[PDB]
Amino acid sequence: KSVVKTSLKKNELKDGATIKEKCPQCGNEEMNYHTLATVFYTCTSCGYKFRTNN
């Protein structure tokens, strides 16, 4: 009944800008990431993740 968008589909879920990242799992060249300097990584292809504190 509301006039605005309260709902979410799958593709809008892209989180953070993308940077060129070699996926240590699938060898993808792109992984999304977030920070804490603790740097997350998330594969674009297989969705594989890892984090980097260093």
Coil, strand, or helix at residue 4?
coil
Tokens 């740097």, located at residue: 39
Residues 50, 41: Cα–Cα separation, whole Å = 5
Partner from another protein, Zn ion, none binding residue 25, C-beta < 5-8 Å depending on class = Zn ion
Q: How many other C-beta atoms can be found within 10 angstroms of the C-beta atom of residue 18?
A: 13
Smallest distance, another protein to C-beta of residue 25, A: 10
- Interacting residue ranges for another protein, rule: CB under 8 A: 3-6, 8, 10, 12, 14-20, 22, 33-40, 47, 49-54
- Interacting residue ranges for Zn ion, rule: CB under 5 A: 23, 25, 43, 48
